[PDB]
Design a protein around this ligand. Structure first.
Ligand SMILES: [N-]=[N+]=NCCn1c(Br)nc2c(N)ncnc21
Ligand SMILES: [N-]=[N+]=NCCn1c(Br)nc2c(N)ncnc21
Ligand SMILES: [N-]=[N+]=NCCn1c(Br)nc2c(N)ncnc21
Ligand SMILES: [N-]=[N+]=NCCn1c(Br)nc2c(N)ncnc21
Lengths: 261, 261, 261, 261
C-alpha cells in the first residue's frame, strides 16, 4: 500500500532509507508521505517521535515501525540488518498490529489546546517558583511546590519518568503515571512523594496558585504557555499502532536497554 | 443474611462489636462465623487483613467491610460513628460491591504451596546474602543482589511498597508491582532499580543461585521456607469484594492518610 | 557599633525594623548600611540570603543575625518576640560568634568570574540537553547526562540539596555536596547516582561536551552564561559569621523545621 | 619488621600468600601473627574486614594493606601483579601511612559492650516491628518506624550506605552517616528521610519504645542483642592505618568500581 520513510539525516540512515525504497519498488507499494498507511522511522527513538507527531492526525490508519541505526531503541527496536526482511514482510501485508496507550494534555486559557504525547508531558515554571494545586477527579489532592511534574504513558515510563523515580509499566496497561521533580517537603508543605498511576477516565488537573505562566513539554516539544488556567491530563482514547513482525517482548527490551545487550 | 464481626480486642473495638451485634438482632440477620456472607472488621487494617485471611477460601461469597477505631485505614475506612448507619444499610442488603485484585504466590520445593496476598509478598534471605535470578515470562531479566524484593497488589501499594519507592496504583488496575530492597549496583552487578508494574497473566519467577532457604512473607505472615526451587508471582484470578455504602474514593483515601485529615 | 537592618518589606517586618532601630537608639549604636559590623535580617531565609549577598565583600567584618517574621528559618532562626532581648545583647557586644563554610564557584570563558554561595550553586542547560564531563581533582569522574547538577554548602544541604536526595550535613563540617537532577542511566550512559561529599581543597570541575551555554544559579540568582569553558567548585576560604546569643542546635533546627514545632 | 598475611582461602589467594612469604624471606622480615606491624590481606574487602577485626586491639601499631585477587576492592585495592613490588617496598619500610575514621558502637543493657566498625553498624528488629526513638546529643530528634537504620563510616559509605541512598564521603572527613531502611511516613508517623552526616563528638542514641530486642550488625558480624536499653553511635577516637606505596585516589577508586574499569 502507501508508505513513507523518515530518516535521522546522517549518511547511515539516509542510505538505509534509499535502499528500502529501492527494495519496496519490487512490490505493489507506493511512496506517499501525505496519506501513508505505513510509517518507517530510521534512526533513534527521537526520529520515531517526530514521525509519530508528523502524522498524529491519522493514527488510526497507520502502522508504525522503527529501525535503530544507533543503539537499541524502545520504539526503534529493529536492526538495519533486518531491513530487507522488513521490506518483504511489510509488502506482503497481513502482519499483526499492537497498540500502545497515549496521553492527552489539555491546556486552558482565559481558548484551549489539546496535545497527544507518546512519551510524556511535563510542566515547569516560566522562571520563578513552581506551585500548582493538583486535582484528581475534581478533588483537591495536594499543593505541589518543586521543580515541576511529569505525566508519562506506559511506553514513556522508560524515558524521563524513569529518571524521576517512576515505575516501569508494561504498555498493555491503559494508564498514566505522575512523577515529581524535586518537591519541597517540610512541616508546612506536603506532597505525596510517590509516583501515582492513574487508570483510564481519571482526570488529573493542574491549577495555578500565583504565576499563570508555565513551560509545558509534550515529548520533544517545549513551549512557554501564558495565562494558563488549567492543565488537564487523561489517558487518550487514541492509540499508536505498530506493525508486528516477530516477538520482541517489552521486558526483554527493558533488559537489553538497561541490564546488558 | 449470615454475618460475623471480628475485633482488634481492645475495649473500644470489643464494645463496638457487641453494639453492632445488638443492632443486627433487630433484623433478619444471623451471626455465623463459619459461612458468613458479610465480614465486618473492627480495628485497623491489620485487623482487616486477619479477617481476609481467616476467610480467604470463601472470597467469592463474602463482602468485606472495615471500621477503624483508631486512625483511618485503607481497608478499615469507616468511622465508629457510622456503625448504626452501617447496620441498617447492610441489613436491608441491596448494596453495591467493589472488587480489588489479589496477588498469588507459588512456592515450589524439591511439593508446592500457594498463597493469596491482599497487600504484598516479600522474599528475603534466611541469614546470609540474598541473590536470586529474576525471570519474567520465562525470560531471564536480572540477577538481583540486595536485601530482598517485594511484590505488591494495587491496594497494597500504599503499604510496604510505598516505603520502598514504589508507585501508588489505583486498585481498579489489575496488576502487580515489584520493588527492590537495598540493591547493590556496581560495574559487575546490575539491577533495574525502578519499580516494575506487571499486568494480568505475566508470571514473575524468583530462582535461587546459591542458598535455597528464604524468609517469605505474605501480608502479616512470615515463614522461613527451606529448599526452595522457585517463587512465582502473578495477579490472582480471585478478587476481594467490599460492601460499598457511599463514595470514598481511593485518591481521597490516599490524601486523608498521607497529606492531611 | 555600626549596624544595619534589612526587611522583607511587608508591614510586619518593616514595623519590627523600626522598633529595633528605636531600641538601638538607647545605646552606643550607629546605623550604617555602608560599613556595618552587624547585619540584622528581618523576614525569612530569602531575606537573609539577600543580606548576605549585599555584603559578601565584608564577610570577615560582619556578624549576621536573622529574625523570622513568618515560619522558622535555618538562618532566620529567632522569633520577633525576642527582638527586644536581641537589641540589648547585641548592643552590649561581647557575644560569641559561629562560622559556616561557603561554596566558591568559578566560571571560565574564552575572562572568568567567581561567586560565593551560602546555600548552593546549580548548573543546567540553556534549553537543549545537559551533558557535562565531571572532573574531580583533574581526574575524569563521569559524563553526566540529565537535568543538571547542584553543589551545596553544609547549611545549604537543608534547601535544594534535600529535595534532590542529598544528605543533611552539620555545618561544622567543611565540605561541599554534589547532587544529581534526573540523571539518565542505561547500558551506554552511567552516572554515580549517589550524592558526593567533598572536603576542603578538592576541586570539582564541570566541562562542556557540546553546548557551551549554561543556566547557572548561585543561591537566589540565576543567569544564562554563554561560551562557558569550565565551572569549578570548591569550599571557599571565606566563612559567614553569625552572632550567637543562645543555644539553638542545628539538629534541633532540622527537627523543628521538618518533624514538628 | 613483624608481619602476617591472611588469605581468602582459595587456590589463587593461598598461592599468592606463600609467594609473598617466600619473597619476604629475602629481607629482615619476621612472620608473626600475634604482634605484627604489617597486616596483608589477600582476597577481597571481606577478607580485609576480617583482618581488621582480627587485630582491632592493636590498630595503632599496624599498617594494613589489601590485595584483590578478584575484582577491585575499596580496601583491597592492589593487583596480584604488584605483589613482588609490594614486598620490596614494605620490606625497606619508610613508607607513608594514611588513616581512615572508624565508628564506635556502644550497646547498653539492664552491662554494656563496645564495637569498632570499619564499614557500618546496622540495627533492625528481632522479628516484629522496628520502632526506636532517635536522640542526637541528648535531644529527641524523631521516632523511627521502618526496617532499620544504618550508621556508616566515610570509607563505609560505598557499601551498605550506598544501597540505602546515602552520600559517598571522602574518607578524610571525620564523620558518620545515618541512613534509613524503608521508613514509614504518613500523617501520624514522621521521619527525616534524608541521610544525616554527623561530625566528631556528636552522639546518636537509639532508644527502644516497645520491644527491647534488636538484631545489631557491625561490618560482617550480626548478633541478636536482648534487653537493650540504648545503642550509641559516635566517630571513634581510633583510626585504621594503611601503608601507602603509590597514589590511588578515593574518587578514582569510586570511578573504577562504579563507572568503568
Ligand atoms: N532517556 N533516554 N533515552 C532517549 C530515548 N528515548 C526516547 Br526519545 N523515548 C524513549 C522511551 N519511550 N523509552 C526510553 N528511552 C527513550
Ligand atoms: N504501613 N503502614 N501502615 C499500616 C496499615 N497498613 C496495612 Br496493615 N495495610 C495497608 C495498606 N494496604 N495501605 C496502607 N497502609 C496499610
Ligand atoms: N526549600 N525551602 N525553603 C526555603 C527556605 N530556605 C532558604 Br531561602 N535557604 C534554606 C536553607 N539553607 N535550608 C532550608 N531552607 C532554606
Ligand atoms: N556492597 N558491596 N560490595 C562488597 C565489598 N565491600 C565491602 Br565488604 N566493604 C566495602 C566498602 N567499604 N565499600 C564498597 N564495597 C565494599
Amino acid at each position: 500500500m502507501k508508505y513513507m520513510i523518515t530518516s535521522k539525516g546522517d549518511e547511515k540512515s539516509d542510505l538505509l532509507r534509499l535502499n528500502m525504497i529501492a527494495g519496496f519498488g519490487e512490490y505493489d507499494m507506493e511512496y506517499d508521505d501525505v496519506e501513508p498507511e505505513i510509517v518507517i522511522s530510521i534512526g533513534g527513538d527521537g526520529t520515531f517521535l517526530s514521525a509519530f507527531h508528523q502524522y498524529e492526525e491519522r493514527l488510526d490508519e497507520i502502522a508504525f515501525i522503527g529501525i535503530h541505526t544507533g543503539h537499541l531503541g524502545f520504539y526503534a527496536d529493529w536492526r538495519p540488518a533486518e531491513a530487507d526482511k522488513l521490506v518483504k514482510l511489510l509488502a506482503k501485508g497481513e502482519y499483526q498490529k499492537v497498540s500502545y496507550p497515549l496521553l492527552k494534555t489539555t491546556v486552558k486559557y482565559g481558548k484551549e489546546a489539546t496535545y497527544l504525547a507518546l512519551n510524556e508531558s511535563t510542566v515547569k515554571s516560566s522562571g520563578g517558583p513552581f506551585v500548582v494545586d493538583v486535582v484528581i477527579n475534581d478533588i483537591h489532592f495536594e499543593r505541589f511546590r518543586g521543580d515541576g511534574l511529569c505525566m508519562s504513558t506506559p511506553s514513556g515510563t522508560t524515558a524521563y519518568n524513569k529518571s524521576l523515580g517512576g515505575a516501569l509499566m508494561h504498555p498493555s496497561i491503559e494508564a498514566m503515571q505522575l512523577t515529581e521533580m524535586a518537591s519541597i517537603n517540610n512541616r508546612v508543605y506536603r506532597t505525596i512523594g510517590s509516583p501515582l498511576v492513574f487508570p483510564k477516565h481519571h482526570v488529573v488537573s493542574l491549577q495555578p496558585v500565583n504565576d499563570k505562566d508555565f513551560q509545558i513539554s509534550v515529548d520533544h516539544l517545549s513551549i512557554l504557555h501564558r495565562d494558563v488556567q488549567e492543565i488537564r491530563y487523561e489517558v487518550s482514547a487514541k492509540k499508536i499502532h505498530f506493525a508486528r513482525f516477530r516477538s520482541f517482548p517489552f521486558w526483554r527490551r527493558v533488559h537489553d536497554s538497561f541490564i546488558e545487550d
